[PDB]
Design a protein around this ligand. Structure first.
Ligand SMILES: CCCCCCCCCCCCCC(=O)SCCNC(=O)CCNC(=O)[C@H](O)C(C)(C)COP(=O)(O)OP(=O)(O)OC[C@H]1O[C@@H](n2cnc3c(N)ncnc32)[C@H](O)[C@@H]1OP(=O)(O)O
Ligand SMILES: Cc1c(COc2ccc(F)c(F)c2F)oc2cccc(OCCCNCc3cccnc3)c12
Ligand SMILES: [Cl-]
Length: 392
């Protein structure tokens, strides 16, 4: 595979394309509290399909710092559009840089996300204008490839992964209309089905500490390198994305845990998940769903190439993840069919969700990579080894 087109950054326009009359380009300064608040307010009410949505996200300053101010981040890649007259921020699109491996070719990219347009400015084709502009700002700044996910069907997805959801408080998820009641099932039966143990099982499980950064970085690298398409974290990335900083982060976003071998004291596994809350719109019983999203993990057992051993170790580790998330008062535990997730999603009672998240690469062509599912969109242990990157 390889790039699709070569960019000459000296021929890249120094000025952005036209916007709809009455709007103007903005660069968001997320270090400025009022501008951070502007992005948050736009996302809170407008990062939603339309007025009919039953859920919106609840962002926090902590989440936005974690998502958008990762190592190498640039304010030029926090793109906004404002209404000229009111100054209101009406759209956004963001990138942060990272390195990925695409079938053994190292690639500097940006990960693009937080594309969002004010509900009242939809269907005006501002989206391609936002994409072309952040593209322009990346081209000017060293970067000619990007990686991103979307639910929308765009050409040539590099992979597609199915959504899965493990009920931690099933009743709440039923009451807000997310989890169905099967059959001749009953609420009590679904509550029993989802009941978790109160204590973890993996010997040596403990919260990750900053002293674990190096060994987690190394383990994660060796583990992800096994996947056709994967993220090549630096040490700084591990510190940013994986180590909660209670001094400086007001509302914890990442939960990370390691397994310190009881005999060797070497860390032999870790996993992590992040918190992104959903607002429940006008439900008289609940107004939020606390969702945990499975993030990165790794285990020394993978390197034996013994799939039965690996399944066994992941079943233990991920059930401990659920137990920890439940103890932490999360209501649901979300994951995709990427990594070795098909080894454990179904058995740990993750429910299959609707449709697929697609992964794309911009300006890079490679054979599609297996996304953890077969052609029937069912988790398949023969269709892993493909997607070794997750995105928030
Ligand atoms: C080298 C650097 C490269 C950097 C750039 C790399 C590429 C990055 C690409 C972006 C990756 C973003 C990753 C994420 O953030 S994915 C998350 C996307 N955001 C949301 O879901 C928030 C809620 N939704 C909205 O705000 C609106 O529905 C959005 C803004 C998404 C569409 O607003 P609207 O409904 O008003 O549409 P339009 O009239 O302006 O435009 C319609 C055109 O836009 C195409 N469209 C619609 N949805 C998406 C989508 N999710 N990815 C890519 N394209 C999309 C659509 O097919 C049509 O295409 P075409 O007619 O031109 O064929
Ligand atoms: C999103 C998402 C869902 C939906 O989760 C729930 C929504 C409402 C509920 F009541 C509920 F219980 C959920 F589990 O289930 C998933 C399973 C696997 C992965 C999922 O999303 C992966 C990417 C999440 N990016 C969220 C985001 C990113 C950037 C800006 N704003 C929001 C999801
Ligand atoms: Cl979903």
């Amino acid at each position: 595979g390889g790039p699709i087109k070569i960019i000459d950054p000296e021929k890249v326009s120094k000025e952005p394309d036209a916007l709809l009359e009455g709007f103007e380009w903005a660069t968001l300064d997320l270090t400025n509290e009022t501008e951070l608040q502007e992005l948050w307010d736009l996302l809170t009410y407008h990062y939603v399909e339309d007025d009919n949505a039953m859920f919106r996200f609840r962002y926090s300053q902590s989440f936005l710092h974690w998502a958008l101010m990762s190592p190498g981040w640039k304010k030029e890649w926090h793109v906004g559009v404002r209404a000229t007259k009111s100054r209101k921020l009406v759209a956004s699109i963001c990138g942060v840089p990272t390195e990925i491996n695409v079938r053994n070719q190292k690639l500097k990219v940006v990960e693009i996300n937080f594309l969002c347009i004010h509900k009242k400015l939809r269907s005006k084709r501002l989206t391609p204008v936002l994409i072309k502009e952040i593209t322009r700002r990346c081209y000017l700044n060293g970067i000619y490839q990007a990686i991103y996910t979307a639910g929308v069907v765009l050409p040539t997805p590099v992979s597609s992964c199915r959504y899965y959801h493990r009920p931690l408080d099933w009743l709440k998820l039923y009451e807000v209309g997310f989890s169905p009641l099967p059959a001749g099932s009953t609420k009590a039966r679904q509550i029993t089905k989802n009941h978790l143990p109160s204590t973890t099982s993996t010997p040596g499980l403990r919260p990750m500490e900053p002293k674990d950064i190096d060994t987690v970085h190394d383990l994660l690298q060796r583990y992800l390198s096994r996947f056709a398409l994967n993220q090549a974290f630096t040490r700084e990335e591990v510190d940013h994305w994986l180590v909660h900083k209670p001094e400086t982060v007001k509302e914890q976003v990442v939960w990370a845990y390691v397994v310190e071998d009881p005999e060797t004291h070497k860390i032999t596994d870790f996993f992590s998940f992040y918190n992104l809350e959903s607002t429940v719109i006008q439900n008289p019983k609940h107004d939020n769903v606390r969702a945990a999203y499975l993030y990165y993990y790794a285990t020394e057992t993978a390197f034996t190439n013994n799939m039965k051993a690996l399944k066994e170790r992941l079943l233990m580790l991920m059930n401990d993840a659920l137990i920890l998330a439940k103890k932490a008062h999360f209501d649901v535990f979300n994951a995709l069919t990427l990594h070795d997730n098909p080894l454990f999603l179904e058995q740990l009672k993750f429910g299959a969700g609707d449709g697929q998240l697609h992964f794309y690469l911009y300006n890079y062509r490679t054979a599609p990579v297996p996304g953890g599912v077969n052609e029937k969109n069912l988790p398949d242990e023969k269709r892993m080894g493909g997607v070794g990157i997750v995105m928030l």
